[PDB]
Structures are given as structure tokens and as C-alpha cells.
């Protein structure tokens, strides 16, 4: 129901809770509902959590033209704009990360603190997972995409154990599909990337987070993050993968608010 007009396109966000400013980003392809709810609501008791739909996801305009990391921030920067917020702790997770960095680099004025979650600087100093993996876009349905995908992001056991949680999750992810088209202007966007160099500039104090056992973007790149970016802090999350946020959802919670208690806007 509430849209900024950004960069000529409508961007559907949400806003939550009292407190400083946490500008959460999500990554490829994901609208604001992919975002944990448990961990969204819990950032609320202490913090103005903004969520939001990236252009060509959830309820956001979809234009047809190539994006860029660059234009992600520009348009998280304009998000920030519209609600008159001069400076905001910023989480962004995977291509949210990227779009976080790119923050951090050439906006560093608006960004208070920096959370990098299972994220990774891109390039040849990068290590990627395979490009086939990164198929959670198939010849299955939206449904059946989903369960496929929870194998990248947590274990068998963990998929056995959550059951209930985890399918609960698939209405609202199912309640609006980023579009095919949209999603592959998400998927070239991930190579628009080039900030290796420029990462050692970063003055945001940092958090680096990831589970160890990430599938989807290793782990290494977390590290690789964690020593290039001054003062930056890493953890790591033994019994984890890409979907951290939500199976070691109360130890990151622990480290992430703890980090920002040291932190101000
Ligand atoms: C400072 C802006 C406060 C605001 O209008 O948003 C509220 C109500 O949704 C939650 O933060």
C-alpha cells in the first residue's frame, strides 16, 4: 500500500518500529516478503526497520531495461530520500550485500553502520558457486521451485525439523512471482559488480556475516570481505548456510544486535 517514487519508478517499502533507522536489502530477484518475519519483527522492538521491493520484484515497477548494482543503490539511496532519513544502518543480504557495498563505497555519507550477509565483492578475487546453481528462478511450478530451492539454503535435516515453518513461508512468497524477465535482469546485474579494490575506502564499521556451509555463495567470500574492508567484524555460523538469517536466526540476532548497540545514525 505505500510507494516512493524514485528514479521515475514506484518502489513499494514498508516501515516498522521506533528507534534508528536499519535499511534492509534483499537479494536477487526478492521482494521485501522473502524477508524472515520472526527476524524482521524481532529488529522492530529496537530499531525503524525499512523493507522493501527492488525494481522488478514484489509490488515495485518491473521496467524491461538492464540493471545495475549502481542503480539498486541509487534507488535504495532515493528510498531513503523520500522518507527523509539522512542516515541509515544498512543489512544487506547476498545481491542485497552487493547493493550494500556499493552503498557503503559511493554513498558513505548515508550509511551509519554496514551488515554483509552471505554476500561476496563479485570479480576474479571472488569465488563463486556455480552459475547452475543459482537456478532457484525449470519446467516446475513457483511451488515446487521454492522446495527445490531449500536444498541450497539449509540442510536435509533441517528441511525434515522445519517443515511447518519453511511452508509457510510459500504464500507470501507465491503472492507476487518476480517475473522472468526481471529476474534475469536481477541475474546480469550480479556482473555489474566492481568493488574489490574500492573496498579497502569503506569508513562504515562493518559486521560480515554467513553460514559456513553456504551452498549458494561460499563462505570464503565472507572472509575475503571481512580482511579487505578496514576494522570490519566476521562471523560465521557453523551449522548454516545461505538461509542463516532463518536457521541461526536467534545467534545472529545475539551478534547483530550487539553490533549495533555500539553503533549510531
Ligand atoms: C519517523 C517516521 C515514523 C512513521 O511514520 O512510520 C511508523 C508507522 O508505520 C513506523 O516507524
Excluded at 131 to 157: D, M, N, Q, V
Amino acid at each position: 500500500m505505500l510507494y516512493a517514487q524514485v528514479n521515475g519508478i514506484n518502489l513499494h517499502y514498508e516501515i516498522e518500529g521506533q528507534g534508528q533507522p536499519l535499511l534492509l536489502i534483499m537479494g536477487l530477484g526478492a521482494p521485501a516478503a522473502a524477508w524472515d518475519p520472526i527476524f524482521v519483527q524481532t529488529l522492530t522492538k529496537t530499531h525503524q526497520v525499512i523493507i522493501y521491493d527492488n525494481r522488478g520484484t514484489g509490488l515495485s515497477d518491473k521496467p524491461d531495461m538492464p540493471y545495475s548494482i549502481a542503480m539498486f543503490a541509487s534507488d535504495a539511496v532515493g528510498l531513503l530520500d523520500a522518507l527523509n532519513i539522512p542516515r541509515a544502518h544498512v543489512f544487506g543480504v547476498s545481491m542485497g550485500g552487493m547493493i550494500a557495498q556499493e552503498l557503503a563505497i559511493h554513498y558513505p555519507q548515508r550509511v551509519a553502520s554496514l551488515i554483509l550477509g552471505c554476500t561476496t565483492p563479485g570479480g576474479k578475487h571472488a569465488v563463486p558457486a556455480p552459475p547452475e546453481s543459482l537456478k532457484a528462478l525449470a519446467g516446475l511450478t513457483p511451488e515446487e521451485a521454492i522446495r527445490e530451492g531449500w536444498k541450497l539454503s539449509f540442510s536435509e535435516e533441517f528441511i525434515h525439523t522445519h517443515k511447518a515453518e519453511l511452508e509457510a513461508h510459500i504464500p507470501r512468497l507465491l503472492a507476487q512471482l518476480t517475473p522472468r524477465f526481471a529476474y534475469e535482469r536481477h541475474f546480469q546485474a550480479t556482473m555489474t559488480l566492481r568493488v574489490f579494490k574500492q573496498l579497502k575506502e569503506i569508513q562504515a564499521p562493518t559486521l560480515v556475516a554467513t553460514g559456513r556451509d553456504d551452498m549458494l555463495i561460499p563462505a570464503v567470500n565472507s572472509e575475503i570481505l571481512a580482511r579487505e574492508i578496514p576494522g570490519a567484524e566476521l562471523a560465521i555460523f557453523e551449522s548454516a548456510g545461505h538461509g542463516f538469517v532463518t536457521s541461526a536466526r536467534e545467534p545472529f540476532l545475539k551478534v547483530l544486535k550487539e553490533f549495533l548497540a555500539r553503533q549510531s545514525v
